[PDB]
Design a protein around this nucleic acid. Sequence first.
RNA 1: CGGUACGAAGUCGAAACAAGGUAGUUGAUGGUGAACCAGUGGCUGAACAAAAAA
RNA 2: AACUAGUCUUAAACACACCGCUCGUCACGUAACA
RNA 3: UGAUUGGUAUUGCAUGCCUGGUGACUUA
RNA 4: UUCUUUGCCUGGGGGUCGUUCCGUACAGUUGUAGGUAAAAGGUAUGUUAGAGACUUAGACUAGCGUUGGAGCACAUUGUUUCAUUCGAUAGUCCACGCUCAAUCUUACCAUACA
RNA 5: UAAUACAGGGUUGAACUGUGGGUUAGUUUCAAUGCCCAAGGCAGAGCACUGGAUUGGAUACCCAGGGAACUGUGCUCCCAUUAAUAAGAAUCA
RNA 6: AGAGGCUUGAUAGUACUACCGUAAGUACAUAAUAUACAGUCCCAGCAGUAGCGGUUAAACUAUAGAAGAGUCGAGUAUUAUCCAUACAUACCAGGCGUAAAAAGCGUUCAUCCAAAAAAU
RNA 7: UUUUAUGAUCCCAGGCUGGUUUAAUAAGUCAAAGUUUAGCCGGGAAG
RNA 8: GAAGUUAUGGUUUGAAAAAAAAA
RNA 9: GGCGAGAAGGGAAGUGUGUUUCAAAGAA
Lengths: 36, 240, 67, 199
Amino acid sequence: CSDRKRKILNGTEYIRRKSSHRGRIKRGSQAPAFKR
Amino acid sequence: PRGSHRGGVFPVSGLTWGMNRPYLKRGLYQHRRDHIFTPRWGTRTANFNPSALPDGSTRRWENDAFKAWPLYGLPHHVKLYAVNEARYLVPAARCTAGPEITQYILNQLDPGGAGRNCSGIGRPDVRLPLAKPAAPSSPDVFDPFGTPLSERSRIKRLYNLVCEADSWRVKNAFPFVDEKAALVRDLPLAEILYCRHTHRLQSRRHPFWIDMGYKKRIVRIPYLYRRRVAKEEAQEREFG
Amino acid sequence: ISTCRRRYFKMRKFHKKKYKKKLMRLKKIPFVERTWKTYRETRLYRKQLRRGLPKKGARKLRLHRER
Amino acid sequence: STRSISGRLFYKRRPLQVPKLKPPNIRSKWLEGAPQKKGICVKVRVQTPRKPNSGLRKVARVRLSTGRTVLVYIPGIGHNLNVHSVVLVRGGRCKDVPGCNYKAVRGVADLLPVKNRERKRSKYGVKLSSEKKEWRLQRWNNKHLTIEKDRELFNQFRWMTWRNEEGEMRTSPLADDEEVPRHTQLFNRWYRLKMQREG
RNA sequence: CGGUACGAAGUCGAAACAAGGUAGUUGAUGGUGAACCAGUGGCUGAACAAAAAA
RNA sequence: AACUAGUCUUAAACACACCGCUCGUCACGUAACA
RNA sequence: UGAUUGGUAUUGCAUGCCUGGUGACUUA
RNA sequence: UUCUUUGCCUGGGGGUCGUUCCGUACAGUUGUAGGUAAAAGGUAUGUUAGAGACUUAGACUAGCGUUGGAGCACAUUGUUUCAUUCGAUAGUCCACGCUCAAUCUUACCAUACA
RNA sequence: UAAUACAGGGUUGAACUGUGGGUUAGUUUCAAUGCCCAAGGCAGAGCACUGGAUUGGAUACCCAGGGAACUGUGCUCCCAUUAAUAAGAAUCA
RNA sequence: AGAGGCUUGAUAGUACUACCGUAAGUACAUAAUAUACAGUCCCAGCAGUAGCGGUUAAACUAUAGAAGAGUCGAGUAUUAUCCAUACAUACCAGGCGUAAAAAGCGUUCAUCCAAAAAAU
RNA sequence: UUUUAUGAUCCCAGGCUGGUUUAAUAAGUCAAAGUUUAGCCGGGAAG
RNA sequence: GAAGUUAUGGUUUGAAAAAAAAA
RNA sequence: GGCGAGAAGGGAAGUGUGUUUCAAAGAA
């Protein structure tokens, strides 16, 4: 969470991680969504 | 360990180092024994003997020699032992419970019995310095022969305490008030390390090199003394 | 976290998003064109001279030993 | 304090939860656990130290035998390193130069030892010169010095029964133009012993 | 390729810290040489002003 | 109703103390990853 | 009616002495 | 530093065929280079606030006079000269150093003597 | 957040019951706004954009107008993600 | 100096096995040296984080700078390796309001623990 | 029907064990894991 | 000769077979 | 003709190697 939340805050995850939340710039999910 | 000391090097005596301190720089200075407690248990002589005959008149005892080489059994030792024996026997003397408890207290005060060396104080056949004289130990039973009571030997523990007390015996004005004074004195490390030897550092240096350092000093110290004295004398001659 | 510290992450995240949006328009994918070992690789084996075998034993390696 | 070994999987969980600080000597990771590595100087230049410090630091980019290229500081005053020069490189961090974590061993390979150096010689690969060796022996030829206390004591105690180096005896105390004689069996004993042992 | 870290301080503005002179920042967005701006929903890691009772 | 000197309260990322601190593009070289 | 040991050259961002402006100076 | 059980953290910060799975897909991603001796929480004062309140102490106001409009004098600035010496430069420079310069004062310039 | 319909939870009491629990992934019901999709579509207000001003200058703050978004058993959980700083036992009258 | 290596700006208690203040290299010889000095001036350079060097440096270079000073010593120093001294790898022995850290709120499986601990 | 989050299916890297002394009221076995003569083990072939 | 014997690192990318059906 | 002879093996193997706890009879 320290380095993990730091990556979230600086936005690496925003770019590199798929999101079932979608958005027009973020990567999307083409498979049914489930909590991981 | 091996190699030179890596880190902080402090004098083993506990004295600080500085421009106006006993040591100019950091170091252990284990050879400097003038900064530790070395009692003088011998004698002392002088550089010169004024008398025309070598009678050894300069030789004299050191002050610490009288504590180093004591003599026991002196009259003040005897007097102190007598007073302390009276006070110490007070309990058994004033016990009024019974012979059993009296013997118990006497044994506690001065252990004794078969195979032991005691003072025989409580024995019926030993003389004591009573205040009110009484029968040594009614008329029916006694000793028909003379049989004088034997003397009592000393209490070894108490006598040793009395004798050793000597080692622990310790020997208007210009009204100028001090303002730059300390209210509670001060307790540096040197005051401890001077006399409490077990707190000081044990050397890792070779005794060979310790002896070599002593031999070097014996030859080099006079040269430094003469160096500074010659500086001063040359300056005085130039001024003259 | 405080607002003053939040501004650094704000700026870096915004720069990332902006630079991705800049490329969002394009459609042609750009094309982009080791003897030395890494520290983690080096840390696996011990270089101290044991009896012969360079890297053939637990005492030679730094793996978790079962004991 | 034992909240970290709760449950059944403590023996696998807790050993994972530990400090994760950098290794003590990770600054020299490109030596690959070796005392030192040989490298080729790909670039030789002078860099500007981080402020507030000012000046020029002599540095070189060197390609180690492992193939990695690293920044190496050239300790000492003056050097002859150029491009394509082989240098032995050890672990040493120059705090001024950014990213510099290795130094070059003087006197090894093409890196000559520092000139006009007389202290810390073992840290720059400087041998003990013959002049220094000769002076470390001729230095302890003791000098004779007096403070007039020697004169007083000699005229009071010693002149009465004194023997010259040749064995001659004295017949008068020290004059005003005569120095206090040396002790034939104690003065300069160590140096004389060494000279006589040599020959 | 785009981005990133170090040295340098050059041009352009003045976005934040005071109500920083339009409160700040956040989720996903739209727009813009640059910091940024606008709407919407969150928070406070914000202010201003602030009741007697008929 | 305004100003200076105070004096009081609040806020502060200022403490060389708002002539403070401080953000970024562009330009400029040395590099790692890709 | 009793003369003297160079420089009114730089450096007030080396200082002493001396000034300007603003602040203070409360006790039993 | 009473006890039970899950979740997470290791200074700061940066870049980044496994699938007989539908492949520009699914699943998965804190971690390796390059920088770093700091970074960041609070209380205590000061300073500031295009923040607020207050004493009404000065400021305003009111009264007596000015100055900016014209002439002269001083200083300063601009110009010029071989030189028109120099310092002072918001308040705290500008009738100031210089409480008085035709000679001297003079420290500026020209000439010729050492 | 009036009434009505259908469901909880909480509180109080009686009965029943009799260690029947505390925590929880190879678990999945729900969950602001935005975005994708679908709906409708001009009550209000309102990105981008237009033009009326201020500014050396503004791509803004101010004004007028405005076809993006504002109601879904869908897709769906990114967050300064919801009553707080995880849940339970013990210590108190 | 029977000998060299390293230090010669501050900073580290220099450990520790028997002795545990129960003594003399005690006195004389025998009293000291370096925040004295010289060369360089944000240069050359040094250093361990901090830092020093701005033309009068106990911090760079120099030890005939003096028979100089501190330690170890036939050795000594640099680099490297670690279970790298309590950068407690935190069981002994760290944390999760504000400084890194409580999952968005919840329902559960397995494990774990509770209530008849130890014994049965 | 058999395995499987107590890690099945399924890649790469590594044989395991012992060594007496061992300062500090840190020891009566060196005390989660650090070794050094050694212990145990490590196919078959003239077809 | 037998019976018991915690796995570790490379970040890892959860179901694998058999059987049934298929042609 | 009879005995002995592995340059004293690190080439295989991860739930393996080894370790710990045991057990092992001819002349029945």
